[PDB]
Design a protein around this ligand. Structure first.
Ligand SMILES: Nc1cc(Cl)c(S(N)(=O)=O)cc1S(N)(=O)=O
Ligand SMILES: [Zn+2]
Length: 257
């Protein structure tokens, strides 16, 4: 009875195996644009993905991860609310069964069709495993996806999904440039949170971009063709793999604009 997004193993059940699910800094959260405060102390956000080197893509049973070689100082996120440098390790998405839902963070309660998460770990902790055990171990750059014009830079990801339809399947995925998934503006909201999937560790500094990227209906439809189940098992379409907004509690969301 592994965790998932179904009625019997979904978000409302996670607290049993992962008590921190009801913690003080859980993610995602609803971003109230009028309550968020502009913070002039925020330094410019720096996204340096020029030397990013992807290794492959994997269907982990709940979504898919595009993994990067993080053994060297490449693909770094810094500046903004961050102290030091965070290295890119992987990115994945959360999406819905319908265009009207799919994102984890919401803006004034608005749900986007999907949400992209570029995960980075604080280099002062040596690696990802040690980083997640620290309050400032990770920095996740979140980007909303809305349905409209196609996103050319996402097509290579979309076309490879056919080869990893079921849980456990992976495929070589090199030379993918994550810069093609970024919107024009780097304006963002930031707050201290957690992983949105079990183990739900509260080790994340969230940086959510205000500007969404547009992807075509055809592109997101292919995301929905993936399977939660493994090869040869009853088909369970991989959709609605998003956790709903959690209590903000004692936290303030800061705006870079
Ligand atoms: N490993 C991992 C790390 C982070 Cl930080 C996040 S998220 N959703 O908090 O960005 C999700 C995952 S997972 N289990 O989906 O691969
Ligand atoms: Zn995520």
């Amino acid at each position: 009875h592994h965790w998932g997004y179904g009625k019997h193993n979904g978000p409302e059940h996670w607290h049993k195996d992962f008590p921190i699910a009801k913690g003080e800094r859980q993610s995602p959260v609803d971003i109230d644009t009028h309550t968020a405060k502009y913070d002039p102390s925020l330094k410019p956000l720096s996204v340096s993905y020029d030397q990013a080197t992807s290794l492959r893509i994997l269907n982990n049973g709940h979504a898919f991860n595009v993994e990067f070689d993080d053994s060297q100082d490449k693909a770094v996120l810094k500046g903004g609310p961050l102290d030091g440098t965070y290295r890119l390790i992987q990115f994945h998405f959360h999406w819905g069964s319908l265009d009207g839902q799919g994102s984890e963070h919401t803006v004034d309660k608005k749900k986007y069709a999907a949400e992209l998460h570029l995960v980075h770990w604080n280099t002062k902790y040596g690696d990802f495993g040690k980083a997640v055990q620290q309050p400032d171990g990770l920095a996740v750059l979140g980007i909303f996806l809305k349905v409209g014009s196609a996103k050319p830079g996402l097509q290579k990801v979309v076309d490879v999904l056919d080869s990893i339809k079921t849980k456990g399947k992976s495929a070589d995925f090199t030379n993918f440039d994550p810069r093609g998934l970024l919107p024009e503006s780097l304006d963002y909201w930031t707050y201290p949170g957690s992983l949105t999937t079990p183990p739900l560790l509260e080790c994340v500094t969230w940086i959510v971009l205000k500007e969404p990227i547009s992807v075509s209906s055809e592109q997101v439809l292919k995301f929905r063709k993936l399977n939660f189940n493994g090869e040869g098992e009853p088909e369970e379409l991989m959709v609605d793999n998003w956790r709903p907004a959690q209590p903000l509690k004692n936290r303030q969301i800061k705006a870079s604009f």
